[PDB]
Amino acid sequence: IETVPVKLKPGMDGPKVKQWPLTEEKIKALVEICTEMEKEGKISKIGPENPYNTPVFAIKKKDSTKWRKLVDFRELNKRTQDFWEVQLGIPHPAGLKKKKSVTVLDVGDAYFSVPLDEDFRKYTAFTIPSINNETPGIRYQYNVLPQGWKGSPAIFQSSMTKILEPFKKQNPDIVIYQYMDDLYVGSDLEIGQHRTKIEELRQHLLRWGLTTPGYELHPDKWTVQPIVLPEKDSWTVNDIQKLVGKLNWASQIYPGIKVRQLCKLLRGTKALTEVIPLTEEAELELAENREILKEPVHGVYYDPSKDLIAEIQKQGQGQWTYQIYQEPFKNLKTGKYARTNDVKQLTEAVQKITTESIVIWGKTPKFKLPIQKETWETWWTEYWQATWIPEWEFVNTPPLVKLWY
Amino acid sequence: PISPIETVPVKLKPGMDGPKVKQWPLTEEKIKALVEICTEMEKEGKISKIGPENPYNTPVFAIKKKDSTKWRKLVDFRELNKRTQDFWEVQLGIPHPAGLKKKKSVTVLDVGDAYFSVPLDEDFRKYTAFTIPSINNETPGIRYQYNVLPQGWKGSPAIFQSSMTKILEPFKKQNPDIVIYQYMDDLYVGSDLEIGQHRTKIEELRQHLLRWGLTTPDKKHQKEPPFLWMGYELHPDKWTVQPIVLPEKDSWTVNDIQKLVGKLNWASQIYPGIKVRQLCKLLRGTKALTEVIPLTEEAELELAENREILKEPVHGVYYDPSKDLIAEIQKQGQGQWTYQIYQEPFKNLKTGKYARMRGAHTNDVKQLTEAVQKITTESIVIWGKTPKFKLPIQKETWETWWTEYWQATWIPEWEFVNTPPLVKLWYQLEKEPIVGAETFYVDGAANRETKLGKAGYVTNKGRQKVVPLTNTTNQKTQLQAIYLALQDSGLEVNIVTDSQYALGIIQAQPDKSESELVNQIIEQLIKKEKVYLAWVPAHKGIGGNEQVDKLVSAGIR
Ligand SMILES: O=C1Nc2ccc(Cl)cc2[C@@](C#CC2CC2)(C(F)(F)F)O1
């Protein structure tokens, strides 16, 4: 078939990112995958005349011992945003998040069927390092649409439609959304019928040379993570002082949180241990304040133009709380994540959050991760299972974990 | 020769054309020099004649060789280079000796006239055009262009190494048992064969190379390990660093100290215990490079221990893929960490040290964690796998600190190993207030234009002190106010602050800091038996904060 012409955002030049050092086992994993990808002509070796580079890693399938290749095209996606967002963007259905069930299907192998503009290929150059640098280090570039690239879905968008067409006409109440390598399929059917309609879909896919996984989400049951206020039988100065600290916070967010009554309550210079009475305005203010804290902030709306930000706090005991927002302290959504290694968990939380994020807004958030850069980089690709990679900056969590948001 | 091998197509950067720099007039003897030289190259293909149709000209020079015996041809390519395309980096790393496998026989071959044995891309030659002037610029001068890689051009290193790789692929494939590391125009070949069957294979290699235009030594193989390479001395058996020699002089100049420090840090890869803290302290401050610096007591001794450690040669052994990697970390002094990596008890593969501070206010458990990270990263680059750690910390101490800390932390498989100083948390902060314990409501303030503050406090027992301060920020007045609550206070004390900033530092159980106050506030903390720290909103009017705040900010605010 003919190749779609692609171009970079003028002024910007191809990726020149370093290849993070890998462990022996993933290097072996990769030379096998790349050795085979070459026979099939999906990638060709390149020469030093190519100054470009995009990093690559090896992760695991849906827990099957088979290694998958993961190219970190985070950079090149930024250098191409114009192409895949405005020029050939893919619309996001507001109905998806409402569906009783959503299945995620990895339609990535579908891209290796299409060729890549002979002129763009150089930009997809990657390198398979070698241990202790005892060897130059294998270089390659893609000939077909690569998987981590947000350009792939956009181009293939035309074919995906022909494929899905029949299935869609025969199933008007089923939403299908494509997002970089995956298809999201949601319906309000009963688990049985849904799971059934999925198999049906795989059969259609199957006819265009494309197998499938599984993995079900239930968006209609995604609820807010309120900011809770203690409710103890007793009450100490300390307990009430804190109750005022957190409440105070709930002021620069959730307009209307009255704390003028609870405050000034039992004041002066008393010990912290000293137990205290109660107030009628108290029970009322508490109730009212928490009542307000249960439901979403007023005046906060999603703004398609601005970035999304996900902040995560390590609560302790395998507990993790996070907030997604665009304007600091103006939360679009908050949540929790629970249930061995802190890094292993955190990576899981990020993937969960990114998924929820993609279902609700169609874009991934940028993460403010509560960890040490080096530690994260050394281990994330050890528990990671997604096909995409979100944006991330390493932050330093304040004594804010006190309040849940 | 001139290797048959395909040629790497190079081009100039996008919006640019070949170079056009006028040829500055050279002297007669020089003009003779270049003439005698080019002619030479020309007869061999390295270059060829071209007329005045080539609008591209790059300057030429000539300078005498060793003792002024023969001249050399210098081609200032600065211009072609800024106009030449960018390439892929030659080496993004260097093998670390400790990551090399032990070999039985090893020899090093060196490609003669490498750059000139590789064919420059035709479509590019036109840019590497220069001219040999006529006595006092009259005649036209001779014009030449290149047909092989120019020894000073941007892409010769890249293109040469790439070619040598393609030329070797067949051979390596035929002898997967032969390891060949290529560093510039040198080839390190090692095998587990016998010196007899080794040299046999070697010739087989020289042959394969000849069939490709690359000439190689005959008996000048230089093999004969030792091998001085990249500051190392390689043996088929082991490895170590180039011999270090400590000057031993009366007075030391800044320049002398730096060199010393540089060598010792280079020695620390295999020599355990090298210390440079004291010597490095002496270089703080913009001091003349020729300025003499007297050695403090501490330094004088540090140089001694180092002196001691270096007297007997120490070697590192090579990597055995079949065995595990063990890494043990010891705590030397404050903020200093040393470690060893071995496979068989005490036969070190590599050594090293960690001292990095990493911000102000930090504690040993946090630093040990950092050393583990560094060693882990380093371990992956060199050996491809993370080692098992033997740390001087209790599984107890670790478990407790990790689970409560705000930051997510991991740490590969480890084991305690009782090698004092053991790492420990020097104090804990209570979680629940201390009943029947004074409650100091500290506070502070400071006039911004003046820099006058009043760190003070008030308790639930009437006591209320307010010491004035000069030249302190709004923060220090809050950190100073907490220092107070710790002094005139019992062994158990509840402190209620409104400085999230203060809460932050203290809450992270730091046992060493860059702040003078913070280190003081630490002694206190390590002396109390129960400390409870709570926070409440600043000048928002709360029972306690308001009151102290009153005598704290009344005047001088
Ligand atoms: O794996 C090994 N073992 C080894 C052992 C002793 C000596 Cl001297 C040399 C080597 C070798 C190398 C190299 C270059 C970095 C110096 C060789 F490639 F074999 F030459 O790398």
Nearest CA to B85 among B11, B138, B183? B11
* Angle, alpha carbons A32-A36-A40 (nearest 5°): 165
| Contact across the interface for A341 and B410, Cβ inside 8 Å | yes
- Which chain B residues touch A131 with a CB distance below 8 Å? 99, 382-384
Neighbours of B188 (CB within 10 A): 22
Query: What 3-state class would DSSP assign to A349?
Result: helix
B8 C-alpha to ligand 1 centroid (Å): 29
Sign of CA dihedral A37, A38, A40, A41: positive
Q: Choose the residue to mutate in B181, B185, B229, B239 for probing ligand 1, maximizing ligand atoms within 8 Å of C-beta.
A: B181
Q: Which amino acid is at B487?
A: Q
Residues flanking ligand 1, CB < 6 Å: B 95, 100-101, 103, 106, 179, 181, 188-190, 225, 227, 229, 234, 236
Q: How far is CA B552 from the centre of its chain?
A: 49
B433 touches chain A (CB under 8 A): yes
CB-based burial, A251-268: b 16+ in 10 Å, e otherwise: eebbeebebebbbebbbe
CA B37 to ligand 1 center in whole angstroms = 38
Contact yes or no for B231/B18 (Cβ under 8 A): no
Any B CB within 8 A of A316 CB: yes
CA distance A331 to A308: 10
Query: Token digits for A281?
Result: 């305005």
Q: Domains of chain B by range and CATH?
A: 1-90+116-156 (3.10.10.10), 91-115+157-225 (3.30.70.270), 226-319 (3.30.70.270), 320-426 (3.30.70.270), 427-556 (3.30.420.10)
| A38 backbone dihedrals φ, ψ, rounded to 5° | -80, -45
Distance CA A401, CA B14 (A): 53
> What span, in angstroms and rounded, lies between the C-alpha atoms of A63 and B240?
44
Task: Please name which of A144, A197, A148 lies closest in space to residue A175, comparing C-alpha atoms.
Answer: A197
Q: Give me the amino acid identity at A201.
A: L
Residue of A nearest to B377 (CA): A378
What sign does the CA torsion over B126, B128, B133, B137 have?
Answer: positive
**How far apart are the CA of A119 and the nearest CA of chain B, in angstroms?**
15
Around Cβ A248, how many Cβ atoms within 10 Å?
17
At B252, the amino acid letter reads W
| H or E element in which residue A130 lies | none
Q: Give the side-chain half-sphere CA count within 13 A for A6.
A: 31
| Pairwise CA distance, residues B443 & B496, whole Å | 9
Contact call for B408 and A345, based on CB within 8 A? yes
Residues B8, A49: C-beta atoms closer than 8 Å: yes
B7 touches chain A (CB under 8 A): no
In Å, how far from its chain's centre is CA A339?
A: 19
Residue B151, chain A, CB below 8 Å: the answer is: no
| Residue A242: DSSP 8-state | H
Q: Which of B129, B141, B146 is nearest to B30 (CA)?
A: B141
Resolution (A): 3.0
Q: Before A296, cis peptide (omega within 30)?
A: no
A153 upstream amide cis, omega within 30 of 0: no
Method of elucidation? X-ray
How much helix, strand and coil, in percent to the nearest 5, is found in chain B? 30, 20, 45
Q: Which of residues 337-376 of A touch B (CB under 8 A)?
A: 341-346, 369-372, 374-375
Residues B293 and B284: their CA atoms lie apart, in Å, by 11
CB atoms within 10 A of CB B497: 26
Residue from B401, B542, B545 whose CB has the most chain A CBs within 10 Å, to mutate: B542
Q: Which of B91, B96, B410, B459 to probe by mutation at the A interface, max A CB count within 10 Å?
A: B410
Q: Which of B174, B181, B172, B195 is nearest to B230 (CA)?
A: B181
Residue that the structure tokens 């506030």 belong to? B521
Write the DSSP symbol of residue A306: S
R_g over Cα of chain B: 34
Q: Which residues of B291-306 are buried (b: 16+ CB within 10 A; e: fewer)?
A: eebebeeebeebbeeb
- Residue labelled with tokens 């530690």: A375
Cα R_g (chain A), whole angstroms: 25
Report yes or no: B400 at the A interface, CB cutoff 8 Å: no
How many CB atoms lie under 10 A from the CB of residue B516?
A: 9
- Give B26: exposed, middle or buried? Use CB within 10 Å, 0-12, 13-18, 19+: buried
Asked whether the beta carbons of B273 and B310 are under 8 A apart, the reply is no
Helical axes B195-210 vs B156-174, angle rounded to 10° = 130
Tokens of B401: 């600190």
Of A214, A388, A391, A404, give the one whose Cα is nearest residue A322. A404
Q: Which of B411, B405, B407, B362 is nearest to B391 (CA)?
A: B411
What does DSSP say about strands B238-241 and B179-183: parallel, antiparallel, or unpaired? unpaired
B218 token code pair: 């005959």
Report the C-alpha gap between B340 and B342 in whole angstroms.
7
Cα distances from B135 to residues B28, B37, B49, B60, B162, in angstroms, run 6, 17, 19, 15, 41
Please state, in angstroms and as integers, the Cα–Cα distance from residue A233 to each residue in A239, A281, B1, following that order: 11, 17, 94
Tokens of A103: 């299945």
Label the pairing between strands B388-391 and B326-331: parallel
Distance from CA of A21 to the nearest CA of B (A): 6
Residues of B with Cβ-Cβ distance to A135 under 8 angstroms: 181
Helix (H) or strand (E) holding B29: helix B28-42
Specify the 3-state DSSP secondary structure of A104.
Answer: strand
- How far apart are the C-alpha atoms of B85 and B43, rounded to whole Å? 30
Cβ atoms of B353 and B339 closer than 8 Å: yes
- Domains (ranges, CATH) in chain A? 1-90+112-152 (3.10.10.10), 91-111+153-222 (3.30.70.270), 223-302 (3.30.70.270), 303-403 (3.30.70.270)
Nearest to A49 among B87, B373, B458 (CB): B87
Long-range contacts of B252-259 (CB under 8 A, 24+ apart): B252/B292, B252/B293, B252/B295, B253/B289, B253/B290, B253/B291, B253/B292, B253/B293, B254/B283, B254/B287, B254/B288, B254/B289, B254/B290, B254/B291, B254/B292, B254/B293, B255/B289, B255/B290, B257/B282, B257/B283, B257/B293, B258/B283
HEC readout, B463-526: CCCEEEEECCCCCHHHHHHHHHHHHCCCCEEEEEECCHHHHHHHHCCCCECCCHHHHHHHHHHH
Q: How far apart are CA B205 and CA B207, in angstroms?
A: 5
Instruction: Please enumerate in sequence order all residues whose Cβ is within 8 A of that of A121, keeping only pairs 6 or more positions apart, or say none.
Output: A141, A142, A143
Burial of A28 (0-12, 13-18, 19+ CB in 10 A): middle
Q: Exposed, middle or buried by CB within 10 Å (0-12, 13-18, 19+), for B117?
A: buried
- State the binding site of A: 106, 181-182
Distance of CA A204 to the CA centre of its chain: 28
Q: How does DSSP assign B425-467, residue by residue? A: ------SS--SSS-EEEEE--B-TTT-EEEEEEE-TTS---EE
Nearest of A105, A113, A110, A87 to residue A176 by alpha carbon = A105
**Would you list which residues of A are annotated within the binding site for Mg(2+)?**
106, 181-182
Q: Distance from A344 to chain B by nearest Cα, in Å?
A: 9
16-75 in chain A: CB under 8 A from chain B:
18-19, 21-25, 27, 47-51, 53
B439 touches chain A (CB under 8 A): yes
Q: First CA to last CA across chain A, in angstroms?
A: 51
Give Dmax (Cα) for chain A.
Answer: 81
Locate the chain B residue with the closest alpha carbon to A380: B410
Contact A388, A77 (CB under 8 A): no
Extended strands (E) in B318-396: 326-331, 337-344, 347-354, 388-391
